[PDB]
Design an enzyme around this catalytic site. Structure first.
Site, PDB file in Angstrom:
ATOM      1  N   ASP A 119       1.110  -5.055  -4.421  1.00  0.00           N
ATOM      2  CA  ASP A 119       0.236  -3.998  -4.894  1.00  0.00           C
ATOM      3  C   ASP A 119       0.483  -3.644  -6.336  1.00  0.00           C
ATOM      4  OD1 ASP A 119      -1.185  -1.591  -5.202  1.00  0.00           O
ATOM      5  OD2 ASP A 119      -0.496  -0.792  -3.359  1.00  0.00           O
ATOM      6  N   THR A 120      -0.302  -4.250  -7.218  1.00  0.00           N
ATOM      7  CA  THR A 120      -0.113  -3.927  -8.629  1.00  0.00           C
ATOM      8  C   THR A 120      -0.437  -2.495  -9.044  1.00  0.00           C
ATOM      9  OG1 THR A 120      -2.290  -4.870  -9.145  1.00  0.00           O
ATOM     10  CG2 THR A 120      -0.392  -6.330  -9.291  1.00  0.00           C
ATOM     11  N   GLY A 121      -1.111  -1.764  -8.154  1.00  0.00           N
ATOM     12  CA  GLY A 121      -1.378  -0.367  -8.535  1.00  0.00           C
ATOM     13  C   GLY A 121      -0.242   0.618  -8.249  1.00  0.00           C
TER      14      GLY A 121
HETATM   15  O1  LIG Z   1      -3.142   5.392  -2.083  1.00  0.00           O
HETATM   16  C1  LIG Z   1      -3.079   4.303  -2.639  1.00  0.00           C
HETATM   17  N1  LIG Z   1      -3.893   3.322  -2.208  1.00  0.00           N
HETATM   18  C2  LIG Z   1      -5.016   3.756  -1.393  1.00  0.00           C
HETATM   19  C3  LIG Z   1      -6.310   3.044  -1.587  1.00  0.00           C
HETATM   20  C4  LIG Z   1      -7.067   2.823  -0.425  1.00  0.00           C
HETATM   21  C5  LIG Z   1      -8.329   2.223  -0.540  1.00  0.00           C
HETATM   22  C6  LIG Z   1      -8.823   1.830  -1.806  1.00  0.00           C
HETATM   23  C7  LIG Z   1     -10.195   1.207  -1.910  1.00  0.00           C
HETATM   24  O2  LIG Z   1     -10.377   0.175  -0.930  1.00  0.00           O
HETATM   25  C8  LIG Z   1      -8.050   2.048  -2.973  1.00  0.00           C
HETATM   26  C9  LIG Z   1      -6.780   2.658  -2.862  1.00  0.00           C
HETATM   27  C10 LIG Z   1      -3.608   1.879  -2.301  1.00  0.00           C
HETATM   28  C11 LIG Z   1      -2.455   1.527  -1.339  1.00  0.00           C
HETATM   29  C12 LIG Z   1      -2.863   1.678   0.114  1.00  0.00           C
HETATM   30  C13 LIG Z   1      -3.923   0.889   0.631  1.00  0.00           C
HETATM   31  C14 LIG Z   1      -4.342   1.063   1.962  1.00  0.00           C
HETATM   32  C15 LIG Z   1      -3.693   2.014   2.772  1.00  0.00           C
HETATM   33  C16 LIG Z   1      -2.632   2.793   2.263  1.00  0.00           C
HETATM   34  C17 LIG Z   1      -2.215   2.629   0.931  1.00  0.00           C
HETATM   35  C18 LIG Z   1      -3.519   1.244  -3.674  1.00  0.00           C
HETATM   36  O3  LIG Z   1      -3.505  -0.147  -3.438  1.00  0.00           O
HETATM   37  C19 LIG Z   1      -2.271   1.698  -4.401  1.00  0.00           C
HETATM   38  O4  LIG Z   1      -2.126   1.003  -5.612  1.00  0.00           O
HETATM   39  C20 LIG Z   1      -2.310   3.167  -4.756  1.00  0.00           C
HETATM   40  C21 LIG Z   1      -3.452   3.580  -5.715  1.00  0.00           C
HETATM   41  C22 LIG Z   1      -3.169   4.880  -6.436  1.00  0.00           C
HETATM   42  C23 LIG Z   1      -2.187   4.908  -7.459  1.00  0.00           C
HETATM   43  C24 LIG Z   1      -1.880   6.134  -8.084  1.00  0.00           C
HETATM   44  C25 LIG Z   1      -2.550   7.317  -7.692  1.00  0.00           C
HETATM   45  C26 LIG Z   1      -3.534   7.283  -6.681  1.00  0.00           C
HETATM   46  C27 LIG Z   1      -3.844   6.060  -6.046  1.00  0.00           C
HETATM   47  N2  LIG Z   1      -2.209   4.158  -3.658  1.00  0.00           N
HETATM   48  C28 LIG Z   1      -1.244   5.240  -3.800  1.00  0.00           C
HETATM   49  C29 LIG Z   1       0.168   4.876  -4.104  1.00  0.00           C
HETATM   50  C30 LIG Z   1       0.845   5.769  -4.948  1.00  0.00           C
HETATM   51  C31 LIG Z   1       2.198   5.560  -5.213  1.00  0.00           C
HETATM   52  C32 LIG Z   1       2.874   4.450  -4.652  1.00  0.00           C
HETATM   53  C33 LIG Z   1       4.340   4.248  -4.938  1.00  0.00           C
HETATM   54  O5  LIG Z   1       4.622   4.453  -6.330  1.00  0.00           O
HETATM   55  C34 LIG Z   1       2.183   3.547  -3.810  1.00  0.00           C
HETATM   56  C35 LIG Z   1       0.818   3.754  -3.538  1.00  0.00           C
END
Ligand SMILES: O=C1N(Cc2ccc(CO)cc2)[C@H](Cc2ccccc2)[C@H](O)[C@@H](O)[C@@H](Cc2ccccc2)N1Cc1ccc(CO)cc1
Lengths: 99, 99
Positions: free
Chosen positions: B25-27
């Site tokens: 997960d690059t995000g």
């Molecule tokens: O909620 C997150 N979604 C949720 C999500 C769901 C659906 C879509 C569209 O289909 C887009 C994003 C992803 C990870 C995930 C996927 C599926 C189920 C549960 C989780 C994402 O892929 C991740 O990159 C970050 C994106 C992000 C980053 C910063 C702020 C808000 C959102 N997140 C949150 C996240 C935050 C911190 C960490 C640790 O530092 C890990 C994940």
């Protein structure tokens, strides 16, 4: 280009005449943008993430330019804290993950 | 390996003697895994996602093997719906994004 992951992979996008920055996000199936002005008709959806679910609007067939590359796809607009470009459009620009 | 993004980029990890699958997960800045047993010390933390915040336990200096690559770093354990490997470990295994 190649991008290493020591910092967040942000890109500029142009969407609906406006310029924004977005995160390239391989964990996301779809693209999700902060609330913005977009024409014209749309369908409500829920998405779930860490934290819980949100309600978003789905716009299909939107043109986006990510770097210089055009793609057409679905975008979800809604209360995200961050503009996320997910796999639906990453495939269109030909993005790969390499290690 | 190179991975295209037509499907979710899942890998096998070994951590703490147990075998899991996880999304690349690059995000995500950090790694967060569903509840599982780790030995030892942790700290509470709260992270924000789409949807809201969760409270998580931070463990430092945890060895993970991701594909056949070993890395050590912080993992956050908590009620995420999916296990995600974020950039803190992604840099250790030399992962790049390419378009
Ligand atoms: O909620 C997150 N979604 C949720 C999500 C769901 C659906 C879509 C569209 O289909 C887009 C994003 C992803 C990870 C995930 C996927 C599926 C189920 C549960 C989780 C994402 O892929 C991740 O990159 C970050 C994106 C992000 C980053 C910063 C702020 C808000 C959102 N997140 C949150 C996240 C935050 C911190 C960490 C640790 O530092 C890990 C994940």
């Amino acid at each position: 280009p190649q991008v290493t992951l020591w910092q967040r992979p942000l890109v500029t996008i142009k969407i609906g005449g406006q310029l924004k920055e977005a995160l390239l996000d391989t964990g996301a199936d779809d693209t999700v943008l902060e609330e913005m002005s977009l024409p014209g008709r749309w369908k409500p959806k829920m998405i779930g993430g860490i934290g819980g679910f949100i309600k978003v609007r789905q716009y299909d067939q939107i043109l986006i330019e990510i770097c210089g590359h055009k793609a057409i796809g679905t975008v979800l607009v809604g209360p995200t804290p961050v503009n996320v470009i997910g796999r639906n459009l990453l495939t269109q620009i030909g993005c790969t993950l390499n290690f």
